[PDB]
Task: inverse folding
């Protein structure tokens, strides 16, 4: 009942790492997302838990996505993909995964691209959504190249 005063007086003490998390437990999703916007990348997972806890609001996920779109340079795709999957949209998952896998394929890392495409294929299969043709075609081509290399090794 008295969360807001505790959070305010704790923020007035000069610290802002634990008071920001307290604003989350203050039954104030707006303040929660507003302060979590300025937090780090490692804290994002916790906000995803908040998405599991406060499904009424829709601005938190949108603004987290907006802040992470232009955040620094491209990062580990699987983190963004799993957080979008927890959000519940798989088409953007396939799109981003295909983009990153194509980048790796052009860089020459066929194994990493194949692994990421297989992971995306399995994730799509779990959600019972029809597998996009481009994803399957790229996975088949890379798998065929890997099999050809393995058979040439024999």
Result:
């Amino acid at each position: 009942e008295e969360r807001l005063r505790i959070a305010q007086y704790y923020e007035n003490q000069g610290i802002w790492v634990k008071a920001a998390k307290h604003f989350e437990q203050a039954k104030n999703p707006t303040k929660s997302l507003k302060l979590y916007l300025k937090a780090g990348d490692q804290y994002i997972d916790d906000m995803i838990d908040l998405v599991c806890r406060n499904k009424q609001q829709e601005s938190l996920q949108q603004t987290l996505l907006d802040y992470l779109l232009e955040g620094e340079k491209p990062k580990d795709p699987i983190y963004l993909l799993k957080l979008y999957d927890k959000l519940g949209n798989i088409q953007s998952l396939v799109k981003i995964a295909i983009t990153i896998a194509s980048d790796e394929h052009d860089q020459g890392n066929y194994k990493i691209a194949h692994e990421r495409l297989f992971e995306t294929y399995q994730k799509v299969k779990e959600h019972n959504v029809a597998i996009p043709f481009d994803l399957e075609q790229k996975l088949m081509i890379i798998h065929s190249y890997i099999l050809a290399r393995k058979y040439l090794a024999y």
About this structure: The chain is about 75% helix and 0% strand. Residues 133-153 form the longest helix (21 residues). Residues 81 and 93 are 6 Å apart (CA to CA). The two ends are 71 Å apart (CA to CA).
